[PDB]
RNA sequence: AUCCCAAACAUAUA
RNA sequence: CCUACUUCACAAAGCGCCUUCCCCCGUAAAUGAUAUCAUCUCAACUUAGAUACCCACACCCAAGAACAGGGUU
């Protein structure tokens, strides 16, 4: 019964491990984890957590690239919010659509 | 990169020393930073079963600054098994008795509550004042930032900002002061 | 030879000798070694990073638990980089 | 994050409708496509 | 005692402020509803369960379409606290038979024919 | 070298969009560690546990041996990863 | 022919890095002449 | 519109400002041209591709193996190509899609090496005092794919 | 505290967090939209 | 001696803090704002002479107190354990020997209650009682 | 009425 | 602990002897503010505020249930 009921915990706490690892790398590059994954999903880079953690380990400066991209998007978002009126959108903030 | 196998493993899992000033910092924030660093939750390689803890060295723990009135109010409780041994002591008293115990107990509370807590608390080093043994000082690598920004007082406010800050009211011609 | 690194297949000893031999065959000075990163110098689990240099430019670095093993493995690293047999090489094209 | 995805007119769940799930996931080497997914 | 609920009809006299708030169109009112369940049938009385079995809403977050007749409105008006109903706007007319197997639905509430994968 | 975030702690990475907008290209070269930032090479069964406890900084518990039951269950020929 | 017993990793990436595996000094700066903190000379 | 300097009148976060859009576009054009000449010449080495094949995301490189938890309707040793590549990277550059990358800028091949069924896994349900004791054996089917090559192409 | 601590005259009243209130408001706004789309 | 500068942005306000668009823009760390409302011996001036309002007078008084007990005006003594945001004077606060269970805890005050309407920048507000 | 009982933290863009 | 007294008499004992400590954080006194006088301070501000003990086979013993411990010059 434990061998059965443990598969759901397997998924649960492996996702927790990946979230912790990504938080470690993100803190290495100056960005908390909420900001990273949120503002990265706000650029249609639909990358899941397993690959992000595996990139934190086995590919450090492509992770640096993704973190820099996230910080860029965050700054563009804060600039847009600071826009008190009508403002052109940022350069990465643009949304690509598909039918 | 492109190292050999064993040197690559040693590079990955090697453990880095960390100094951490403590002057005019609240014990809890030092405790939080030390808690994350001791158990390895700053390495992307983290895992509980890997034991990737990294050493930590706090200094100036005598100049810890609790917030509010926590010196008078916060009380730490201990009890030897012998009757009447329920003793509990304020923070000021425990600071005078042994001025490395507030930060020690904070880091002890935050760490995970398992049979790895003792290893992590052994890899913590706490030194009350700026002194530090040389065989430790020549192991250090990094100096983590001070969490609380120490608000400087009038004494180090140079005249440029004293007179640049606008005078905001007009006392009458005559006054005692 | 897939996955097998170079020097697990080409069993040599005394790498820095072959390094200076190759760099002299290319008419360049014997490379000068320095200490890049150091963590835990006194304890029994140290990490020393030794970087070989070629007249103010760096051609490899390597980790070890002694400055000497670090020297040796940084030599192995540089020797790999020169011979175009690193781990980032283009995979064989089948 | 999926509230932002909705205020931009996307499926809140990237495994919903979008490029990621609609398009085929493989093709024979020469180029002739392959029978679609049962999903 | 607990009972059913009779909502006074004054709750359904939409104001002009409501009209300009949501995608209002009082005249030329919309034809269909797309309805999705967002709460559990359990911990809720039995007639709510029966209604949520009558309107096809078994699985949550699975959208189902219905008319805007006052009968179906009188059914929805007692499970309204378990459903999100959005108009099914049709910017281009409802599909023809040849291009019907190649249609799809967008989260904004629109049914669209131009869905090439 | 653009530094909204101070891309100097580690190295510098440059971000850009292809002309249309459906691909993002980032350029990250391996920044090399400078020379003038470098340094030159410099050219008995209870006390046993206590000394190993101070040298490796682990606590005393793990150093005592374990019984036969906890040493026939150990795997002699474990699988080799990679 | 391999035994049908459990499979631990869904992958066997024999060269699992292209960009340099992580050691604690990636992303950590360097200082003038290699001064560990609080030093003088 | 003036405030004397104070610890909380200003925002603690350091207010950055974005670059000018036209110069920003010129910079972006320059760097993409640089990466384009790098790809055209042959600077790169090995390549890693983050791929979305058939359930979920795999980080894949040449020569390696990937275990999929379902059948794929393909004879043994029958070459295949994996569309839906959402990251491809080398030593010096990496390209991310938004979300995906066109079928011309990245080409990921593959082959099927073996088709197996997983080890016999157990589903047992149990409840106390109710004589509820269910047992079942499940054998999921699996197929293992050898990734062969990842060819990037200059089309940017 | 007499027993069955969640009831009695000296019961312990639970606190209303901010995110619970935010969830209440989310459901309630959805209800307002339902009221509209059943109003025609 | 202190005077009035020729550029008060918002002249004729509710109080000389409102005459500088400050009413919710000072903490205890603002040493000079307090120093402009202090005698040479630590205790601050009557509100009549300065012209301050009731609430802002109270706020500057409390800020002066917390600034003293933090050790931020050492040249204002009337002639060691280091704190900040010391609400109550340390001579009249007792230890918390009996802190209740989860649901009736007694917690150590921090900050001052006259600074709730300050600007807030982290989304989780100031947590006065700790 | 055996022994207080989570360690902490007023502010980095929800 | 056994010198005497006392049951007893290589000793164990009491009804017989000798030793027993450490200022231990509690109080008020002044100057003085918002509230210019006035007021001990949920304002700042000067003061009445522990040791000691232990540490390197066999035969007897003031050490011992066995094992331990002191002695064998």
């Amino acid at each position: 019964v434990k061998c059965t009921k443990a598969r759901y915990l397997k998924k649960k706490n492996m996702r927790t491990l990946w979230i912790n690892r990504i938080t470690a790398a993100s803190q290495e590059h100056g960005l908390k984890y909420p900001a990273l994954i949120g503002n990265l999903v706000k650029c249609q880079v639909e990358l899941n957590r397993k690959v992000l953690a595996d990139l934190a380990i086995y590919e450090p400066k492509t992770f640096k690239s993704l973190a820099a991209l996230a910080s860029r998007r965050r700054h563009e978002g804060f600039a847009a919010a600071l826009g008190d009126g009508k403002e052109p959108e940022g350069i990465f903030s643009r949304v690509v659509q598909y039918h | 990169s492109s190292f050999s196998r064993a040197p690559q493993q040693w590079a990955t899992f090697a453990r880095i020393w960390y100094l951490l000033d403590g002057k005019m910092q609240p014990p809890g924030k030092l405790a939080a930073m030390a808690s994350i660093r001791l158990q390895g939750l700053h390495k992307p390689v983290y895992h509980a079963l890997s034991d990737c803890g990294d050493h930590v060295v706090i200094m100036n723990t005598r100049h810890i600054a609790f917030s509010g009135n926590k010196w008078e109010q916060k009380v730490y409780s201990s009890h030897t098994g012998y009757p009447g041994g329920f003793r509990q002591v304020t923070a000021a008293q425990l600071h005078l008795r042994d001025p490395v115990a507030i930060v020690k107990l904070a880091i002890y509370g935050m760490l995970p509550k398992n049979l790895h807590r003792r290893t992590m608390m052994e890899r913590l080093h706490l030194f009350p004042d700026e002194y530090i043994p040389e065989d430790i000082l020549k192991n250090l690598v990094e100096e983590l930032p001070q969490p609380r920004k120490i608000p400087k007082r009038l004494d180090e406010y140079t005249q440029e900002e004293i007179d640049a800050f606008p005078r905001l009211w007009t006392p009458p011609e005559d006054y005692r002061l | 030879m897939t996955g097998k690194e170079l020097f697990e297949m080409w069993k040599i000893i005394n790498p820095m000798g072959l390094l200076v031999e190759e760099l002299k065959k290319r008419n360049v000075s014997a490379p000068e070694s320095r200490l890049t990163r150091q963590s835990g110098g006194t304890t029994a689990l140290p990490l020393y990073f030794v970087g070989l240099y070629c007249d103010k430019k760096l051609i490899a670095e390597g980790p070890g638990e002694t400055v000497l093993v670090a020297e040796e493995e940084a030599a192995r690293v540089a020797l790999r980089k020169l011979y175009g047999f690193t781990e980032n090489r283009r995979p064989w094209n089948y | 994050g999926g509230q932002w995805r909705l205020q931009q007119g996307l499926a809140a769940n990237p495994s919903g409708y979008g490029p990621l799930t609609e398009l085929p996931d493989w093709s024979y080497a020469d180029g002739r496509p392959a029978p679609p997914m049962k999903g | 005692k607990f009972t059913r609920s009779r909502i006074p009809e004054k709750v359904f006299q939409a104001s002009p402020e409501d009209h300009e708030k949501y995608g209002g169109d009082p005249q030329n009112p919309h034809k269909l509803h797309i309805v999705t369940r967002i709460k559990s049938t359990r911990r809720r009385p039995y007639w709510e369960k029966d209604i949520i079995k009558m309107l096809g809403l078994e699985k949550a977050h699975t959208p189902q379409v219905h008319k805007n007749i006052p009968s179906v409105n009188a059914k929805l008006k007692v499970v309204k606290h378990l459903i999100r109903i959005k108009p099914l706007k049709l910017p281009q007319g409802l599909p023809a038979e040849e291009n019907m197997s190649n249609t799809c639905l967008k989260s904004t509430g629109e049914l669209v024919v131009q869905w090439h994968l | 070298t653009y530094s909204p975030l101070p891309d100097d702690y580690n190295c510098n990475v440059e971000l850009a969009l292809t002309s249309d907008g459906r691909t993002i290209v980032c350029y990250h070269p391996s920044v090399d560690i400078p020379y003038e930032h470098t340094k030159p090479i410099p050219r008995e069964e209870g006390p046993m546990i206590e000394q190993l406890s101070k040298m490796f900084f682990t606590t005393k518990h793990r150093w005592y041996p374990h019984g036969r039951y906890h040493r026939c269950r150990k795997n002699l020929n474990p699988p080799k990863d990679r | 022919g391999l035994d049908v017993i459990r499979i631990r990793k869904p992958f066997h990436t024999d060269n699992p890095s292209i960009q340099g595996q992580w050691h604690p000094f990636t992303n950590k700066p360097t200082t003038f002449r290699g001064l560990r903190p609080r030093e003088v000379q | 519109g003036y405030v004397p300097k104070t610890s909380l009148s200003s925002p603690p976060w350091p207010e950055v400002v974005l670059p000018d859009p036209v110069e920003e576009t010129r910079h972006h054009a320059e760097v993409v041209k640089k990466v384009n000449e790098m790809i055209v010449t042959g600077q790169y080495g090995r390549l890693f591709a983050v791929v979305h094949f058939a359930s979920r995301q795999w980080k894949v490189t040449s020569e390696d193996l990937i275990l999929i938890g379902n059948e794929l309707d393909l004879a043994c040793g029958e070459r295949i190509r994996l569309e839906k590549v959402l990251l491809v990277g080398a030593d010096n550059f990496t390209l991310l899609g938004k979300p995906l990358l066109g079928k011309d800028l990245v080409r990921v091949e593959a082959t099927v090496i073996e088709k197996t069924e997983s080890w016999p896994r157990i589903i047992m349900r149990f409840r106390k005092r109710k004589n509820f004791k269910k047992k079942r054996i499940v054998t999921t089917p699996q197929t293992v794919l050898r990734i062969n090559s990842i060819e990037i192409a200059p089309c940017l | 505290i007499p027993g069955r601590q969640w009831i009695g005259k000296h019961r312990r009243p639970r606190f209303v967090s901010l995110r619970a209130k935010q969830n209440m408001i989310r459901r309630l706004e959805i209800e307002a939209e339902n009221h509209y789309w059943l109003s025609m | 001696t202190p005077k009035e500068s020729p550029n008060p942005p918002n002249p004729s306000g509710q109080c000389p803090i409102c005459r500088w668009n400050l009413k919710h823009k000072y903490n205890y760390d603002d040493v000079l704002l307090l120093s402009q409302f202090i005698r040479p011996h630590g205790g601050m001036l009557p509100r009549k002479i300065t012209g301050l309002c009731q609430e802002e007078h109270r706020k500057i008084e409390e800020c002066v107190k917390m600034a003293h007990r933090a050790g931020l005006l050492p040249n204002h003594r009337p002639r060691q354990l280091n704190r900040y945001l010391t609400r109550w004077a340390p001579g009249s606060v007792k230890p918390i020997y009996k802190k209740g269970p989860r649901w009736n805890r007694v917690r150590m005050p921090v900050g001052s209650p006259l600074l709730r309407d300050n600007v807030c920048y982290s989304r989780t507000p100031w947590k006065l009682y700790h």
Side-chain angles (χ1 to χ4, degrees), chain G:
Chain G
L2 310 192
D3 302 357
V4 197
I5 54 169
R6 197 167 76 112
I7 304 299
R8 297 166 69 149
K9 302 263 194 68
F11 19 89
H12 178 275
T13 169
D14 237 323
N15 308 70
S17 190
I18 289 76
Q19 193 172 111
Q21 179 162 334
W22 178 98
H23 53 57
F25 289 135
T26 68
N27 311 329
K28 292 192 78 64
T30 318
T31 192
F32 196 82
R33 284 200 284 120
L35 303 167
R36 55 182 78 93
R38 292 278 165 178
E39 236 166 45
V40 178
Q41 290 258 301

Side-chain angles (χ1 to χ4, degrees), chain D residues 19-29 32 35 37, chain H residues 52-54 72 74 78-84 100 107:
Chain D
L20 278 156
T21 51
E22 271 65 2
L23 287 153
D25 289 340
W26 54 280
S27 315
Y28 285 70
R32 60 199 172 79
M37 322 302 281
Chain H
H52 194 294
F53 175 81
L72 269 180
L74 285 172
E78 194 170 12
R79 198 178 187 84
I80 287 302
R81 158 168 183 179
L82 287 63
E83 289 91 317
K84 300 201 178 161
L100 266 50
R107 184 186 169 78

Side-chain angles (χ1 to χ4, degrees), chain E residues 12 19 22 24 30 33 68 80-81 83 85-86, chain I residues 27 30-40:
Chain E
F12 293 75
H19 284 303
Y22 320 84
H30 55 280
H33 282 167
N68 191 7
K80 79 194 183 183
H81 59 59
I83 56 175
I85 68 206
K86 302 291 284 176
Chain I
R27 294 269 183 274
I30 293 281
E31 289 296 87
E33 181 149 304
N34 286 336
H35 286 191
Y36 187 85
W37 293 129
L38 299 180
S39 52
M40 49 194 239

Side-chain angles (χ1 to χ4, degrees), chain E residues 81-112:
Chain E
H81 59 59
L82 322 169
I83 56 175
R84 167 159 40 76
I85 68 206
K86 302 291 284 176
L88 192 161
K89 291 178 283 190
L90 285 146
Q92 47 184 6
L94 69 174
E97 62 91 358
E98 76 296 20
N99 55 13
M100 188 162 54
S101 154
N102 286 26
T103 178
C104 179
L105 173 53
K106 292 297 196 297
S107 56
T108 180
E110 272 82 336
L111 169 62
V112 176

Side-chain angles (χ1 to χ4, degrees), chain B residues 1-17 55 123 134-142, chain C residues 5 7-8 38-47 49 61-65 69 73 76-77 80-81 86-88:
Chain B
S1 149
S2 70
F3 316 148
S4 293
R5 294 296 221 80
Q8 180 54 269
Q9 188 274 355
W10 203 286
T12 297
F13 288 122
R15 46 182 72 165
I16 312 307
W17 288 69
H55 301 250
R123 298 187 176 127
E134 183 65 12
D135 50 328
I136 305 309
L137 184 65
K138 74 151 162 149
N139 278 339
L140 289 177
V141 173
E142 196 263 10
Chain C
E5 191 263 309
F7 290 142
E8 305 174 24
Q38 171 175 22
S39 56
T42 60
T43 75
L45 305 180
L47 172 87
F49 265 111
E61 61 176 11
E65 71 284 8
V69 154
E73 173 262 328
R76 290 184 177 280
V77 172
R80 270 175 221 142
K81 279 197 179 192
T86 59
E87 80 191 353
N88 313 342

